[PDB]
Each structure stands twice: as structure tokens, then as C-alpha cells.
Write a protein that binds this ligand. Structure first.
Ligand SMILES: O=C(CSc1nc(O)cc(C(F)(F)F)n1)N1CCCCC1
Length: 131
């Protein structure tokens, strides 16, 4: 992926609290995480893709190669096994932990970067625009 490269600012969020609740996130974290308006910085160097998230809540970073499972510590401190692939221009990220999973799709749509986060029956949509 590389039409994803850039700096992106959160401009809208739907159902994020519900998503965090479903994932198992404690209330105090949800309160701070849900108010935050992160920047996401995507860069690519050969086959390594780097996704940074920066906010008043927490900074995080993952670097990965498509199709290679890796250990991820999430912003809420879950230790998950993550696999990210590129599927019709959509970055498909699955996190697996304790026999559970969540799926995070990052897609380009017009000039927006759209993030869809799915946990059980909950779907949260987060839209970012170029900073
Ligand atoms: O606040 C964050 C990180 S910021 C973020 N922004 C998005 O648009 C999407 C996601 C993610 F990881 F849930 F997909 N996190 N935590 C994500 C994992 C669970 C608790 C909240």
C-alpha cells in the first residue's frame, strides 16, 4: 500500500465508544480515547509499512510487512497477534487475542482515509482527511 501515505487528521467518528466497550476497554480509557482526535501518519520504505497514531491520549506505532503476522501492543494495552494484508486497495488488519478478533479496514475514499473497526456486532467508522 502507498496511496495511503501521508499525514491524516481525525475529522469524524461513529460508534467508537461502543467499539471500545465491545473490545473490553475499561471506562477511564474510553473516556480519554473517545475525546482524542488523533493524527495518523502512514509511511512506506520498501516492503515495510509504518502507521503512527499521535494523540493527547496515547501515541502508538506499528511497522509491518503485508501478510506477516506480528506482535502488537494496542493503545489500550492488549497484546494481540496482528496480520495486515492489501485486498482490492483496502488495508485489512486483523488483531487476534484470547480466542477473540477484531478487524480494522483502512480505505481511501475520495480524499478521505476511512477506518472501519469491527468487533462482534459493533461497527465504528472513523474518517480522516489530509492534515
Ligand atoms: O484510541 C485508540 C487508538 S486511536 C484509533 N483510531 C482509529 O481511527 C482506529 C483505531 C483502531 F485501532 F481501533 F482501529 N484506533 N484505541 C484503539 C484500540 C482500542 C482503544 C482505543
Amino acid at each position: 500500500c502507498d496511496a495511503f501515505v501521508g499525514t491524516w487528521k481525525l475529522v469524524s467518528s461513529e460508534n467508537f465508544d461502543d467499539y471500545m466497550k465491545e473490545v473490553g476497554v475499561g471506562f477511564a480509557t474510553r473516556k480519554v480515547a473517545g475525546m482524542a482526535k488523533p493524527n495518523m501518519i502512514i509511511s512506506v520504505n520498501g516492503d515495510v509499512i509504518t502507521i503512527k497514531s499521535e494523540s493527547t491520549f496515547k501515541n502508538t506505532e506499528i511497522s509491518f510487512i503485508l501478510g506477516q503476522e506480528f506482535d502488537e501492543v494496542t493503545a489500550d494495552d492488549r497484546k494481540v497477534k496482528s496480520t495486515i494484508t492489501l485486498d482490492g486497495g483496502v488495508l485489512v488488519h486483523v488483531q487476534k487475542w484470547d480466542g477473540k478478533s477484531t478487524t480494522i479496514k483502512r480505505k481511501r475514499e475520495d480524499d478521505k482515509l476511512v477506518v472501519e473497526c469491527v468487533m462482534k456486532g459493533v461497527t465504528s467508522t472513523r474518517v480522516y482527511e489530509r492534515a
